[PDB]
Design a protein around this nucleic acid. Sequence first.
DNA 1: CCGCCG
RNA 2: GCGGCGG
Lengths: 176, 42, 1106, 105
Amino acid sequence: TSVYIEDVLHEFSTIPGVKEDVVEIILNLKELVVRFLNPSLQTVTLLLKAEGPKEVKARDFLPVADVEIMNPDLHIATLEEGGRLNMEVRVDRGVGYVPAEKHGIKDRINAIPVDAVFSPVRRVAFQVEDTRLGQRTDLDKLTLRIWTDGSVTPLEALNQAVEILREHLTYFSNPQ
Amino acid sequence: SDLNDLYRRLINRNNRLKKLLAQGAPEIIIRNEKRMLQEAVD
Amino acid sequence: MEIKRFGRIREVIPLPPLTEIQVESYRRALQADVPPEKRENVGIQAAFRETFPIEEGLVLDFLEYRLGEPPFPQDECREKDLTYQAPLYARLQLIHKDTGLIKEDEVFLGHIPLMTEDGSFIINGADRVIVSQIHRSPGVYFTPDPARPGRYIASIIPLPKRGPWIDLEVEPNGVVSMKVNKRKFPLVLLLRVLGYDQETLARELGAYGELVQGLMDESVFAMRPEEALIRLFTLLRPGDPPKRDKAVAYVYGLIADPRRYDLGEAGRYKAEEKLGIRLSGRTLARFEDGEFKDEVFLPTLRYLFALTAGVPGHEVDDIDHLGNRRIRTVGELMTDQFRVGLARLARGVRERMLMGSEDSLTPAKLVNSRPLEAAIREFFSRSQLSQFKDETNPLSSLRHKRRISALGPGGLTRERAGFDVRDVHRTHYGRICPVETPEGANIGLITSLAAYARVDELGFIRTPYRRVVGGVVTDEVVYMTATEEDRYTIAQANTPLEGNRIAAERVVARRKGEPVIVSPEEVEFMDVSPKQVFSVNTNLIPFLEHDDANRALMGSNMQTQAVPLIRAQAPVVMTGLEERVVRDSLAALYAEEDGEVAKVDGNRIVVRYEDGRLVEYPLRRFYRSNQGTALDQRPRVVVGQRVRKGDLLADGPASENGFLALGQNVLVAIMPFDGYNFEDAIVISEELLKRDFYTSIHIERYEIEARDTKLGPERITRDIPHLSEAALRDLDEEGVVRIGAEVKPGDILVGRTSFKGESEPTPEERLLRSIFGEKARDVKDTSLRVPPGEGGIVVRTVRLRRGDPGVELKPGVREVVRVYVAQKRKLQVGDKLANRHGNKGVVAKILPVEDMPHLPDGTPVDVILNPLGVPSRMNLGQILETHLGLAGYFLGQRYISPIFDGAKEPEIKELLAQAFEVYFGKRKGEGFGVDKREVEVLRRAEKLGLVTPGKTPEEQLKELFLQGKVVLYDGRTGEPIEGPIVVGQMFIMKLYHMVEDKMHARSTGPYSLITQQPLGGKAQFGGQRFGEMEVWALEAYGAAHTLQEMLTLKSDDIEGRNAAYEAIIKGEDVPEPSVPESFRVLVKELQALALDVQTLDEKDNPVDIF
Amino acid sequence: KKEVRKVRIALASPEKIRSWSYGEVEKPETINYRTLKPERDGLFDERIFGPIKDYECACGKYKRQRFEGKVCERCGVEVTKSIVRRYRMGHIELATPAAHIWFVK
DNA sequence: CCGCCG
RNA sequence: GCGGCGG
């Protein structure tokens, strides 16, 4: 949801000894898929800082005991020499899509808000095939295949969705 | 608004004429002023 | 990703240096890179020698012109509003009739602008372009008579403009007419004046034309020779001295009027060939020996008698034939004004030759830089020809760097006469793109030049053709002059060839703009490539061959308004020039020689060539384009890499991987939605915004100046008379605003302070200041605030204090402050995008991936183009690109299809077939078959005639995919959409049309002081005009008050608008407008003058407006 | 006498000229620098045209809206705002007659 | 025609 | 004032 580099004031800047631009970077961070474990983890702030000749990968974030990064080899940046890169990336648990202009997170007066990509699924598809059991041939065999980044599991999702559905069904209770 | 400058002109000459009438009235002067005068009004 | 290209017409020679037109022009213009020794003496040097030997006896001669030390460097010129000019002097030496030749070895007389490596100039801080020009090539031609369908008239056109414009008409009822400046005189008269006697004349001239009887017409004036010279003077319309004032005759001799264009080719070309044959001197120029020689006048009439008579050749001149129109390269345009300056200078130096004391005059006395600077200066900064470089994106710049205009000096062509010129003429073939012209008024008048089209020695746009003797085609090419193209029979390049030999008996060719089927033995020349027929800009549309020319234009022009998207993607399907555009345009940075990479900073790339050298290439980080677009160079090379000569080191503003990219390739379904894609609406998937697919960075350059009033210098400090500290935060630096700060509408960008209500302190504001705090700073708050609309993030700041390093600070101007503000442009509802074929449209609704059209396999589409916009407009090309684009998705491969030679319908189905094994092949293995949904749409497909009844769903779907259509489930209902729908990867772009420029919403604000109007200009906006067109609109409606309201309550009735405002504040009913201040003001305006304008009652009586 | 139905253009009787007139401008005195206030019998004098201020008079005897149509006892100043100010006209008495260029050229 | 930028 | 550009 938000990031902050030490010598950068605006998102449209450039950091010495670093190929990628601030925007090429924050772009790559939204591709970062982290995974919390308990509600007590609403807003985590990962910290990372490496120098010199190296390739920053999402694995270089200093571990946070309760949350895990299933996105390890994601390329974050490349550093020539004297490439001083230190940054703090704010991460949250949310739902749906949210424009960096909608939330406007301000941990530090010089940090830049990023766009929210909460949906933990990339693609869903359902198929209806011919019958397996029964006394009639006109029947449905629904099998749906789901795809997740890693945060939660195909099943986890399915269930939550199933719940949300049910949850709404009940709203047909009190008339007026 | 510019019109005043012209308004001042007319006022001036019209006035200068009132005086140029009471002081003494040398013909050539009376007309040379009426002239300017007529031109101002325009 | 594999890159396959389907071209079968062997492209024989690589495209030329696209900016060559401008580049070389200036080179040959100011031959300033090589010693005074090298031959090329046109332009500068030529214009120099033209007017340098000054013979007032006074003798000042030219030696060498040298120049070269650029005051400052490129960017500095931009950062400081400096015009990037080189310094130019030249050795001159003045001789005397007495003993003595003082040579003042240097007089710097001017500062001429320079030419960037890209081809642009930097006049005052900004980059501009000198657009090329066209006109009737100063020569001689013969055009049919105006109304009289009978005979034709002769024209003799010489420029510059001051020189005469001669015509030769023949009206048998009494005269042979020669006109100069609108007056007619006996053609003979002048003839005699030259020596041509009735006898010799008529006999060699009147061999076959009785018309001659019209010349031997003088049995009275034709018997007096030199006296006719005097007789012709009488002819001049004004009373002057009979003798020597032959100046007017002197004028048509050898100097000023006729043209001093290069002896041999400039005019002489239109001589030798078109008429007569030899040119003594440069023009009908000769005042030598007292007697004159005009080897020109007689033949012009010699061809008149030929034309009107037999068939000496069919002399009828088609005006537009490029063989009679020249293009004015910058060099020529600039060199033009230069000699105009040379002349203006030589004007005063002759004056100072008589004012002369003695031998003591040389540099100073003879030379004054005044004329030449104002001259040149005027061109580059005042001429209606050099303008603001359209740099929406590189391509844009490049076109604007190469188009031709008709309007200009005015002598060439005007506005109200054009129906004839506007047409793409026969000759424009491979010389003027027939598609590059702009829509609306000014069409066909201003157009960009062709692919291979290159300007020759004297302007006629030459084009390349291939020689072919017998049934054999060469690899030898020749750039023909429009005229010379007609002599031969050229054939198309689509003509089948087995290698170096023609292929069919009946092969296409075009004689003289006429389509003719010719034989292998008759083909003398063949086209180089289809490309040459259009422009660069045009040459970018994928399947142009299937697109109506009319829409194709929209398509070409559109690309020029493309905007630099952060993530730049080259077209899934390209023409084959993308690489070059970026190349020849200078967006990307290439590697000079072979070698290895040293440093790959995000600011500079340092490489080590294998030749013992190591250079540092700084990357323009994030510069503000002329149009306000991001211009960064992102290195695409890693530390220590062996680079090939001419390899992309970094990508340009819109070029990635060395390819031109402007917008992105999105998956698109081509069908109708509720209505969100009604007329020309386009639907977009939230999913796009998510991966920052369409995002442009933008910059606005706000500026403020600390003026020097006689009331007290305006200071720029953190101090603001109105006491607020919360708004002073962002403005940390005393006076300036902090970089990285978030400026919103109404915030202070820069602070400034000037003196009170003009001259005197207010006697009413001296009592208010004294009550609460007499010691209140008498200075006022005049600060550069964030203009309503928006700002964003401050990213660069420029201040120019006292001790100016090398900047030209205007007078009165104490110091200047510039503030660059940026922001991110994410695609939103009001934004407008478009494809290379001409389908333009705005975003109607941003749909949640959730319920938008998805394919069997989870993959949703990105955009839905309404099908209905394809039939009326004729641009199949897009539907094609889409098909190929569909293979590209599942085949993961980009293709390159040439203009007329590109991919073909069979081959695409071939790759599509391959694509079915990827899309559906993984489907079979992954373990699942066909949906009951897929079956259902297949039923409606077979009953539709799309599939061949009787085959397996497998087979079926394949045949259905091949057509370019797949199945698609709603997404909202998950129910299929009865009937296959075509989908694919289509290359579409976002245009320089943010809605940022689209919503001035006004409530209340500023009024003009002299005239009562809600003009804007500050934190407040202007209210739209109502015009009478729009009043009538209201009138018809019978919208009385709605109209009354417009005229008074909303505008002029100061007091009225007041009552209204108040009323509305009270939730009351607006007051009744009594008299418009316009009514009352009229009464008075009419009282002020005689007329007693009196308003009346029912019964003719008084009434008071006042 | 309610609705304005007809408008008339007629020549101006000198008597009527003085009729619409309130005072006569007698001196080219626009505004003296020291005091933003107009000079005397100048172009911007307030008696000839009216009150330079909003609903108060020259010296301050009557300053509100309760006595709106009453003229002050010591100096003639009846007022509403600064706009009933821009509705009155003044005249200049010309020595020897001049003519309307409009009626002659 | 109406509109907007430099 | 002049160039450009949207419909």
